[PDB]
Each structure stands twice: as structure tokens, then as C-alpha cells.
Scaffold this active site. Structure first.
Site, PDB file in Angstrom:
ATOM      1  CE  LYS A  60      54.357   3.246  56.771  1.00  0.00           C
ATOM      2  NZ  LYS A  60      53.240   4.060  56.203  1.00  0.00           N
ATOM      3  CG  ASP A 154      48.776  11.212  59.053  1.00  0.00           C
ATOM      4  OD1 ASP A 154      48.723  11.996  60.031  1.00  0.00           O
ATOM      5  OD2 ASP A 154      49.545  10.232  59.041  1.00  0.00           O
ATOM      6  CE  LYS A 156      52.390  13.336  60.573  1.00  0.00           C
ATOM      7  NZ  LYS A 156      52.359  12.809  61.964  1.00  0.00           N
ATOM      8  CG  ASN A 159      52.922  12.145  56.882  1.00  0.00           C
ATOM      9  OD1 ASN A 159      53.848  11.535  57.404  1.00  0.00           O
ATOM     10  ND2 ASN A 159      51.687  12.094  57.347  1.00  0.00           N
ATOM     11  CG  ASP A 172      51.982   7.467  57.103  1.00  0.00           C
ATOM     12  OD1 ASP A 172      51.163   6.528  57.014  1.00  0.00           O
ATOM     13  OD2 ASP A 172      52.449   7.824  58.194  1.00  0.00           O
ATOM     14  CB  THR A 189      49.147  15.213  63.639  1.00  0.00           C
ATOM     15  OG1 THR A 189      49.786  14.079  63.038  1.00  0.00           O
ATOM     16  CG2 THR A 189      50.179  15.989  64.455  1.00  0.00           C
TER      17      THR A 189
END
Length: 338
Positions: A60, A154, A156, A159, A172, A189
Site C-alpha cells: 500500500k 469499514d 464490506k 475489503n 484496510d 461506506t
């Protein structure tokens, strides 16, 4: 039963690492650039090969000035610090981290099987046993994180990475934070936001349990429970409470989802007196062997096609762009503790 004992030992290992990090552990020169795996508003992830081992990694790369401008300083610092300290089978391991004049670098375990999101769109929907298998892993992951007072924020399918054994690797940690009591940041999100985040009143770890409900719904249905063109229209659906379930959903599933997608905090599963056990002992999870899932002894419902180390066919293509290192150091004080 023996979970209480395992979690105490995990907390002592986490607190030891939180207190005394090991850090700044490699450099860009040690890695050969192969392919851009994905892009964002303030950085990218590349497949890299370690030059003197041949080991593949996902690196990353974050642009410091873009992190500063988009108000992501604390979030980025939290991510690296949390990833260094945690250890659990369903969390992507941080292998190396470092910084130069322009960029921040987080080198992680490469997961060639790709995002769950990509597999979900291709198949359309997952069967309930398939979804349950994935849901079980998230339940255990949140039990681990929440006991360390860590909020994930986070969740979803994007990820969630599928490894060579068909198990989930969570990536993430950009919105992850250690918080006793309450926090306030309006991040996440739109489809996955809990009502109390939207209402701007302060929230705790219970937002993760709401997000699990959204995930399970989306895995089983193929689309999320609260959807519209506008994000503002999505927020209105979320706060109104009301959910429509597809007719193919089992009544055990509908029942689990009502207790997860519960607007009233005093009634939402995971938050109550039994806590996580309300979820674990629920009827929809009756056939789940929690220990065997933890140990990765349950045979996976889906194993991604393996095409060698360093194959990228599970990922989209992006315009390959230079990693520009400036001769002047940018944002020195902001990231001094990175």
C-alpha cells in the site's frame, strides 16, 4: 467456554505490542514493482516482489500531501499502529512499514484470490451455507477486535480477500480505532452505515454488528438492504428502520437480520448482556462449528483458481504510474511517529 482464556492471552500480547512497537523495518529499494492492483483518492496498492527472497507482497502506497489534504492523518497513523499490534487468522498481516520524502508504505501479505466483491458479482448471490461460512469468520474477528476495544468501521465485500484455502483475510484498517466508550467521525461506506453514525450523536463498537447484518444480507441477496441513486436517499432508508427481505431467505436468516439491523441500541445483537453469544447461539448459526472455523479445519465452499505466485488475473487493470520520490521531505511533523 475456553474463549475467555484465549482472549485474555490475546489482550496481554496486544497490550505488550501496543506499548512497545517494532517499526521502520524495510525500504522501497528492497522491492521490485510488478503491477498496480487498485487505486484510490490518496494512494494505491501494488503487487511487489522482495528482491532477495522472491516473496510476493501487496504494498500500500499513500501520498502524504493527499493524506494531509483529505484530513486522513490520524486514520493513517491508527491503521499502521493497529496492524502492527494485532494477530488473528482472518486479518491480513502487516509484514513491513516505512516512509520516504513523499510516500507512506505498508507492505502486506499478498492474497491472490481477490476481493469477495468480485466473486459475488460473478456468481450473483451466495447460498446460505456459503454466506454463513464467511459470516462465521467475521463474527470471530469482531469478537477478537472488540475485546481489544478496537472498532473496525469499514466492513464490506471489497475489503474481504479470499485466500488459497477459501478463508477470509480482512484488509484496510484505515477507519480502525481503539475506543473505550464513544467516537464521532462520520466515516464509512453509505450502504454500510449504522443509523447512530448518520444521526451524528456519538457511537460505539455496536456499529460493526449493524455492518455484519448488511454484509450477510448482501452475500445472501446479491444486493445491499438499503439502496438508492443518492447517498442522502440511502441515509433516509437506514434511519427509517424498515427492511424488505427476498422471499428465498430462510426464516432463521430473516430473524438473525432483524436483531442485527436493529435501530434501537438496547435491542441490537452483540450489544446486549450475552453480547456476542446472542449471535453465536442463534438458530441460523446452529450448524457452525466455531472452533473448527477458527482452526481453518472446515472445508471451504469455494477455492479460487490458483495460477502460480504472482498471477493477477483476479484483479482489474490500471494505468501504470511512477512512484515519484521528491528530493524534499514532505509533511515531516504530521507523520513523525509513522
Amino acid at each position: 467456554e475456553s474463549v475467555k482464556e484465549f482472549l485474555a492471552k490475546a489482550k496481554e500480547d496486544f497490550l505488550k505490542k501496543w506499548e512497545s512497537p517494532a517499526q521502520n523495518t524495510a525500504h522501497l529499494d528492497q522491492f521490485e514493482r510488478i503491477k498496480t492492483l487498485g487505486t484510490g483518492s490518496f494512494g494505491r496498492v501494488m503487487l511487489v516482489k522482495h528482491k532477495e527472497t522472491g516473496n510476493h507482497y501487496a504494498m500500500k502506497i499513500l501520498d502524504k500531501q493527499k493524506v494531509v489534504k483529505l484530513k486522513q492523518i490520524e486514520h493513517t497513523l491508527n491503521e499502521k499502529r493497529i496492524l502492527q499490534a494485532v494477530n488473528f487468522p482472518f486479518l491480513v498481516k502487516l509484514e513491513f512499514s516505512f516512509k520516504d520524502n513523499s510516500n507512506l508504505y505498508m507492505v502486506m501479505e499478498y492474497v491472490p484470490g481477490g476481493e469477495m466483491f468480485s466473486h459475488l458479482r460473478r456468481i450473483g448471490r451466495f447460498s446460505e451455507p456459503h454466506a454463513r461460512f464467511y459470516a462465521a469468520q467475521i463474527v470471530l474477528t469482531f469478537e477478537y477486535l472488540h475485546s481489544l476495544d478496537l472498532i473496525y468501521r469499514d466492513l464490506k465485500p471489497e475489503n474481504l480477500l479470499i485466500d488459497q484455502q477459501g478463508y477470509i483475510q480482512v484488509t484496510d484498517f484505515g477507519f480502525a480505532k481503539r475506543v473505550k466508550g464513544r467516537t464521532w467521525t462520520l466515516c464509512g461506506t453509505p450502504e454500510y452505515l449504522a443509523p447512530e453514525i448518520i444521526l451524528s450523536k456519538g457511537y460505539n463498537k455496536a456499529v460493526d454488528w449493524w455492518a455484519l447484518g448488511v454484509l450477510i444480507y448482501e452475500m445472501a441477496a446479491g444486493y445491499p438492504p438499503f439502496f438508492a441513486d443518492q447517498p442522502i436517499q440511502i441515509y433516509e432508508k437506514i434511519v427509517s428502520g424498515k427492511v424488505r427481505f427476498p422471499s428465498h431467505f430462510s426464516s432463521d436468516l430473516k430473524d438473525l437480520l432483524r436483531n442485527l439491523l436493529q435501530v434501537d441500541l438496547t435491542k441490537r445483537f452483540g450489544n446486549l448482556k450475552n453480547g456476542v453469544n446472542d449471535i453465536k447461539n442463534h438458530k441460523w448459526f446452529a450448524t457452525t462449528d466455531w472452533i473448527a472455523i477458527y482452526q481453518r479445519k472446515v472445508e471451504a465452499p469455494f477455492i479460487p483458481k490458483f495460477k502460480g505466485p504472482g498471477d493477477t488475473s483476479n484483479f482489474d487493470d490500471y494505468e501504470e504510474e511512477e512512484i515519484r520520490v521528491s528530493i524534499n521531505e514532505k509533511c515531516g511533523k504530521e507523520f513523525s511517529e509513522f
